[PDB]
Design a protein around this ligand. Structure first.
Ligand SMILES: [Zn+2]
Ligand SMILES: [Zn+2]
Ligand SMILES: [Zn+2]
Ligand SMILES: [Zn+2]
Lengths: 134, 135, 111, 81, 130, 234
């Protein structure tokens, strides 16, 4: 081979972004969640401050002067008590005013939220396939 | 006694325009009392005057509706295929992408939607005082 | 006359208030187009002769040219005490800008 | 949009409209298919009973001035009601 | 009106669209069309009825909103690049200078309207060297 | 009601009748003629089965021309059931139409630009295309034809050298047929449109049937802090 012979000095572990997998995908060498959800808001993706906090706190008291609220980037949506049921994340909400509201946190919803955080089946849904089938 | 008196294309158009809902009038009863209706119904479809739901076993007219829109056929298949090929981005990001291209987006990101004493002194008057809280 | 009108049109597209003296306006006019000062002074006289000779009994269409001719003979005759103001907002409170060009006489002792 | 809307009368859904051009003004309810039609002159109404805004129901009743005649309609949207 | 007649790129769907013209024929065209057509080299104008070859390097931005005035001014600039005199050139003879200006105007008029294209251009060439 | 509603509906009608099949016109016109419409009521109006209505709804939901709203209903006679309603969110549909129109026009523009470029040679045996730059390094000693690296077979010049004019006609055809969409969008941008919701859409309801099982009312739960994705609008 004409390429220079070198010795591996570092090994940078990481993750594959969706773009890299598609781009990378074509002697031969061969050719080719719960913790975070409780820390960020499930509607805006901003850090609540975190598990104990169950509200986005759109307005927070000013540090310099008490009894003087300062507006912070938020949506004031009460956070769910996220629990891991099987392989899905089920969020339970505590209504202010009596069972808690329960719904399945779809991976699409979590993917959207994680993308808002501030380097390293097709046939069925295409036609018909009621929500139960999907 | 025909269910719907129709023996002319003009009569069919006015009857369909008078419907208060979108319940299409069946062709089974329309064909009754009308010697020919498919010939007129097909002619109107070519003129884009009405909408016809046709059977799949063989092309046969069924429940029809008034065409309140424009021409039924205006875009060539060469463009229909391209329209189907285009895949929309995620809704939360579509408005941002439209703004990047200089097109005013008629929507907003849902993430931006900001959807956010006991001791009584006198008791001998108990049961007498009405609560005139407001005026 | 035609290209003088066009130059006045392309000066109405400014995005900020412009205040210039007649000499500066003439210099830029002679740069973009090739209109000199002397012909610009005789614009009013020449137009009057042309109109009188053209049998224009109905002069509804040519009324607008009077304003252009008046502008031409004014900015080329005087240079001191006169200023040219171009604004993109004649009325600041408007959805769409309405450019206007003002030729103002500052010295009341000239007339 | 303050003279017409959807309403439910006697379990039958229909369109409720108020006619004011013809004197006296009257309230008319027409079924979707037109089989059932009922119009009441407003001059006979004594009181206008409306359910409180704190209740999930959107019902509205008109009581006739004197077994007084009662015409009760249920709406679908509070804004229209 | 506001779209490239060739590719019909509306300004609404392309706010970055910028049109350009060529002195040879003065036909409006968007920058995208210019690159995809003339980047390789000279080619005939992409218009129906126009067969005059042109180069990408000669394209410019239209100054005036009137095409005819755009053409007349360019011809005037070309003519004044050769026929350029002043009052001092005739030693204050206003009659001669006015006559000279009138001749230049006629030359510009003929070139713009093509009354006598062959003879007029030869006069420009003859005086250009002299 | 308002001029804004009429123009928006016309744009939706034009897009469906041109860029979609026939049954799609029936489905969307039914939910445009009416307000939020239950799935059962929609089936009765068009006299089509679930297997036929499903494909239409799914394709229209993908393009965001129709929105879905699921809520629980409590009828005294029968046990609680879940009802599905379909309506139109004008801001979503209009944004989708604008994006698709731009993408379709851009794709044709890109294809026209690509076509004007020199063609890239292709190998017949292995059907592996090669660009001009890539083929230049495949020259043989005699320098007669490009030889495929894998097959070692002469390369054949690719087509599309004659299509330089066809694509221009296609773009011309589209812009002429798509003119109404652009004209309608310009007026929409001038004005400002409010975002619709299941409750808001109910303000213009024309009941399809007399005794529809679906109770067309919005009774949100009391003090329910739960929020679903895309459940509210500005
Ligand atoms: Zn938040
Ligand atoms: Zn172009
Ligand atoms: Zn040309
Ligand atoms: Zn090969």
């Amino acid at each position: 081979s004409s390429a220079p012979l070198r010795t591996v000095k570092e090994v940078q572990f990481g993750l594959f972004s969706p773009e890299e997998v598609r781009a990378i995908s074509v002697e031969c060498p061969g050719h080719f969640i719960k913790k975070v959800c409780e820390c960020v808001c499930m509607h805006c993706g901003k850090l609540l401050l975190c598990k104990t906090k169950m509200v986005c706190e759109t307005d927070v008291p000013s540090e310099d002067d008490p009894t003087q609220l300062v507006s912070r980037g938020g949506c004031g949506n009460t956070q769910p008590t996220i629990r891991k049921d099987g392989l899905k994340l089920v969020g339970s909400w505590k209504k202010d005013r009596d069972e808690p509201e329960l719904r399945v946190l779809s991976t699409e919803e979590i993917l959207n939220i994680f993308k808002h955080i501030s380097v390293f089946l097709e046939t069925l849904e295409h036609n018909g396939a009621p929500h139960h089938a999907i | 006694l025909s269910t719907y008196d129709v023996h002319s294309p003009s009569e069919l158009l006015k009857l369909l325009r008078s419907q208060v809902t979108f319940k299409g009038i069946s062709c089974k009863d329309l064909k009754d009392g009308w010697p020919q209706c498919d010939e007129t119904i097909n002619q109107l479809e070519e003129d884009s005057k009405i909408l016809v739901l046709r059977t799949k076993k063989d092309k046969t007219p069924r429940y029809v509706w008034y065409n309140s829109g424009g021409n039924l056929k205006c875009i060539d298949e060469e463009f229909v295929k391209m329209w189907e090929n285009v895949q929309l981005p995620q809704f939360a990001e579509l408005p941002r992408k439209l703004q990047d291209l200089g097109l005013k987006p008629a929507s907003v990101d849902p993430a931006t939607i900001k959807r956010q004493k006991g001791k009584i002194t006198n008791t001998h008057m108990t049961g007498i005082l009405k609560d005139y809280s407001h005026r | 006359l035609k290209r003088l009108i066009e130059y006045l049109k392309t000066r109405m597209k400014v995005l900020h208030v412009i205040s210039e003296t007649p000499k500066s306006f003439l210099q830029h006019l002679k740069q973009l187009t090739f209109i000199e000062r002397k012909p610009l002074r005789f614009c009013s006289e020449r137009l009057s002769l042309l109109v009188r000779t053209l049998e224009v009994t109905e002069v509804e269409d040519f009324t607008a040219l009077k304003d252009i001719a008046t502008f031409a003979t004014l900015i080329s005759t005087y240079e001191e005490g006169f200023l040219l103001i171009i604004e993109p907002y004649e009325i600041e409170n408007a959805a769409v800008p309405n450019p206007i060009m003002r030729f103002t006489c500052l010295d009341a002792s000239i007339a | 949009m303050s003279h017409s809307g959807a309403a439910i009368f006697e379990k039958v859904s229909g369109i409720i409209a108020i006619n004011e051009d013809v004197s006296p003004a009257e309230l008319t309810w027409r079924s979707t298919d037109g089989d059932k039609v009922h119009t009441v002159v407003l001059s006979t109404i004594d009181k206008l009973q409306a359910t409180p805004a704190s209740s999930e129901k959107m019902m509205l009743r008109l009581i006739g001035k004197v077994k007084p005649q009662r015409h009760m309609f249920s709406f679908n949207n509070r804004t229209v009601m | 009106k506001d779209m490239c007649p060739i590719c019909k790129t509306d300004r609404y769907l392309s706010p970055d669209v910028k049109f350009l013209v060529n002195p040879e024929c003065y036909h409006r065209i968007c920058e995208s069309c210019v690159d995809r057509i003339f980047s390789l080299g000279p080619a005939q104008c992409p218009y129906k009825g126009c067969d005059k070859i042109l180069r990408k390097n000669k394209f410019k931005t239209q100054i005036f909103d009137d095409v005819e005035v755009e053409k007349e001014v360019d011809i005037r600039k070309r003519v004044f690049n050769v026929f350029n005199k002043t009052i001092d050139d005739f030693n204050g003879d206003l009659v001669e200078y006015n006559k000279y200006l009138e001749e230049v105007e006629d030359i510009i008029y003929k070139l713009d309207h093509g009354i006598d294209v062959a003879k007029t251009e030869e006069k420009l060439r003859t005086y250009e060297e002299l | 009601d308002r001029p804004i509603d009429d123009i928006v509906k016309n744009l939706l009608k034009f897009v469906v009748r041109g860029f979609y099949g026939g049954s799609f016109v029936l489905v969307l016109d039914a939910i445009l003629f009416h307000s939020v419409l239950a799935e059962d009521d929609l089936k009765q109006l068009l006299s089509i089965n679930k297997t036929e209505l499903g494909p239409l709804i799914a394709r229209l939901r993908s393009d965001r021309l129709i929105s879905i709203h699921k809520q629980r209903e409590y009828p005294p006679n029968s046990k609680s059931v879940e009802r599905v309603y379909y309506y139109v969110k004008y801001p979503h549909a209009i944004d989708a139409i604008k994006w698709k129109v731009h993408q379709v026009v851009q794709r044709l523009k890109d294809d026209l630009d690509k076509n004007s470029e020199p063609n890239g040679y292709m190998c017949p045996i292995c059907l592996t295309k090669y660009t001009q730059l890539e083929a230049v390094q495949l020259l043989n000693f005699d320098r007669t034809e490009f030889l495929c690296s894998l097959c070692d077979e002469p390369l054949v010049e690719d087509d599309s050298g004659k299509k330089n004019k066809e694509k221009q006609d296609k773009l011309n055809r589209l812009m002429d047929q798509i003119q109404p969409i652009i004209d309608s969008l310009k007026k929409i941008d001038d004005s400002r449109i409010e975002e619709n919701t299941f409750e808001i859409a109910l303000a213009r309801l024309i009941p399809p049937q007399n005794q529809s099982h679906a109770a067309y009312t919005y009774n949100p739960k009391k003090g329910s802090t739960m929020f679903r994705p895309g459940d509210s609008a500005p």
